[PDB]
Amino acid sequence: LRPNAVVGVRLAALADQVGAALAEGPAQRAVTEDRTVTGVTLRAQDVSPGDLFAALTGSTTHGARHVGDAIARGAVAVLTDPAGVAEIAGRAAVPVLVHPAPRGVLGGLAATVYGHPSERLTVIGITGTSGKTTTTYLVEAGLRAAGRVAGLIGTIGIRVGGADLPSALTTPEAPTLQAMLAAMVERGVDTVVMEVSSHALALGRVDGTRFAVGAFTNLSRDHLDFHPSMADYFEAKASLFDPDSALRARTAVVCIDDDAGRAMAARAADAITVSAADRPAHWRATDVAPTDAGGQQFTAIDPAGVGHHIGIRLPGRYNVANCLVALAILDTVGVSPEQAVPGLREIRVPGRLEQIDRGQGFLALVDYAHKPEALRSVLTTLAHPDRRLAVVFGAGGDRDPGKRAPMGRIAAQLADLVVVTDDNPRDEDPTAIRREILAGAAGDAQVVEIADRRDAIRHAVAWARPGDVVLIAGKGHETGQRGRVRPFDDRVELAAALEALE
Numbered sequence: 001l002r003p004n005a006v007v008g009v010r011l012a013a014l015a016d017q018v019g020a021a022l023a024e025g026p027a028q029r030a031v032t033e034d035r036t037v038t039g040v041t042l043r044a045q046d047v048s049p050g051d052l053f054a055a056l057t058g059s060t061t062h063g064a065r066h067v068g069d070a071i072a073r074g075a076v077a078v079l080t081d082p083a084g085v086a087e088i089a090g091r092a093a094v095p096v097l098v099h100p101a102p103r104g105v106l107g108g109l110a111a112t113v114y115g116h117p118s119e120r121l122t123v124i125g126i127t128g129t130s131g132k133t134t135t136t137y138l139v140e141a142g143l144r145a146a147g148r149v150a151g152l153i154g155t156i157g158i159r160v161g162g163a164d165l166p167s168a169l170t171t172p173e174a175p176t177l178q179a180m181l182a183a184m185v186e187r188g189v190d191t192v193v194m195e196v197s198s199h200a201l202a203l204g205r206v207d208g209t210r211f212a213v214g215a216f217t218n219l220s221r222d223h224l225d226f227h228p229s230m231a232d233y234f235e236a237k238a239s240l241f242d243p244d245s246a247l248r249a250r251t252a253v254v255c256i257d258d259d260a261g262r263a264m265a266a267r268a269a270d271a272i273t274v275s276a277a278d279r280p281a282h283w284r285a286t287d288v289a290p291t292d293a294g295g296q297q298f299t300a301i302d303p304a305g306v307g308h309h310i311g312i313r314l315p316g317r318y319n320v321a322n323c324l325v326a327l328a329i330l331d332t333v334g335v336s337p338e339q340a341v342p343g344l345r346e347i348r349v350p351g352r353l354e355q356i357d358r359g360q361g362f363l364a365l366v367d368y369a370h371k372p373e374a375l376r377s378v379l380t381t382l383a384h385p386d387r388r389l390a391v392v393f394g395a396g397g398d399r400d401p402g403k404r405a406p407m408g409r410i411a412a413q414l415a416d417l418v419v420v421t422d423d424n425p426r427d428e429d430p431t432a433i434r435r436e437i438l439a440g441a442a443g444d445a446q447v448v449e450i451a452d453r454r455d456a457i458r459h460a461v462a463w464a465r466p467g468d469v470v471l472i473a474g475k476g477h478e479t480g481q482r483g484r485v486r487p488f489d490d491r492v493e494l495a496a497a498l499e500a501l502e
């Protein structure tokens, strides 16, 4: 939610803090001494009375052009850039604070009006190319097993303890974040575990937030259509670990298995390191054993050299690594592996190598892997000689068209059966999309095009023999087929197909 009980901030105080100016005149600085701001939003439609409207520029528009609407919703002030005041021109009924780079000071403003919620919460922020969602779930399940009230914030949604709101973004815009945090304080939450996307660091979405811990899972080619370079992409994320940085967390935890990880550990200087790949780390895993129920058990050796028999419901070598990160994260936040192990044992994180096992025979999995790097890593962790691997997936219309032809190649290379299907074709004639992935497909593999997604799932389930694996890729927890939005859920379709087998 927003929080029910916020004591406001005199608008004068917000202005002096940020050091904004007043669009009308320096003497408009009499009525600013008067108004109280009790909310902050950067989406006109979302203003409550008493809120400061942040009118920002963006790639599609400028919020300055929605001042009318914000004011009409009872906004008591606007905070905008000079490009913005130009848009307003004359005449808003309310005061206009002007900053260069407002987005870059919005966080701290929001943090102030909401009374600095992060200073009352142990906030854990997990960044990295992959594994943020999974690691957050593992941390959250540890937390609950040890009887701590926990909020979660990430791709899948928001959890205020037991509550279960859905999220638009993986990390919400700074006023939303702070207000959520504020609400979590009111709701009795003690600890909050957060995915922190590299977009959020770039656009200063997490600006007013104090982190008790920052975790780094890994890095690989992603988001290179927002970040202008792999550098910037690293740099964004680094800003959570750099000792001297503004966002630096009280404790950093870094996985060492990736090269990028090594590079972050060296950045954070006093990182707690973590390795599932026989690398020297404070936390290390060994004796990794596949188990019946497609889980994995292993020994987690802590920074004190003490072993711990752990058991995780998720397949794939790197999930041992996620688990370690989570394990380290809990330990620093004062939760021992003894306390967390029961939670970890059971936790199934949705759309992430989620195994459906209605019936028996082979491994049937649902996974979110939707980018060429994503897909390669999964298929490899799931490849074993003497076992067959089917992958079914497709690509999204109006979305990054470069990624299609690569994926089909990666698929062809690592799977025994690939099935090319629809996954939100949107406006585009769906057979183009599929035909591009199949261009990718151009010995080992065996590839076929089934346009209908349920039919794709069914064919692959009828193709499996005992002990083989079927992976439904590229939707994960996401639902619906957009084309209208037709209703679709991969877990449900997958389970349905397995029942149809006898």
Ligand SMILES: CC(=O)N[C@H]1[C@@H](OP(=O)(O)OP(=O)(O)OC[C@H]2O[C@@H](n3ccc(=O)[nH]c3=O)[C@H](O)[C@@H]2O)O[C@H](CO)[C@@H](O)[C@@H]1O[C@H](C)C(=O)N[C@@H](C)C(=O)N[C@H](CCC(=O)O)C(=O)O
Binding pocket: 042, 043, 044, 045, 056, 057, 058, 059, 060, 061, 062, 063, 064, 066, 155, 168, 169, 170, 171, 172, 173, 197, 199, 200, 203, 226
């Ligand atoms: C690229 C990016 O970060 N974009 C975000 C950005 O949009 P941007 O400022 O152009 O927005 P704009 O529409 O052109 O105008 C700027 C401001 O005008 C204001 N506005 C606009 C229209 C209106 O009617 N009223 C209004 O107030 C909006 O509040 C807007 O924030 O500001 C908006 C909110 O501040 C977001 O909608 C938008 O994210 C869109 C939804 C998005 O797709 N973001 C994705 C790409 C993203 O952020 N992804 C990562 C996760 C990646 C992962 O999980 O691997 C994430 O954290 O979500």
Ligand SMILES: Nc1ncnc2c1ncn2[C@@H]1O[C@H](COP(=O)(O)OP(=O)(O)O)[C@@H](O)[C@H]1O
Binding pocket: 128, 129, 130, 131, 132, 133, 134, 135, 155, 195, 217, 218, 318, 319, 321, 322, 352, 353, 367, 368, 369, 374, 377, 378
């Ligand atoms: N440590 C990891 N390394 C590589 N791939 C991973 C890792 N953890 C999870 N994955 C896979 O990558 C995809 C996205 O990971 P997820 O757990 O949703 O984290 P994120 O929020 O970082 O995307 C999933 O399909 C998942 O199975």
Ligand SMILES: [Mg+2]
Binding pocket: 128, 129, 197, 222, 223
């Ligand atoms: Mg990402």
Ligand SMILES: [Mg+2]
Binding pocket: 132, 133, 154, 155, 156, 170, 195
């Ligand atoms: Mg995520």
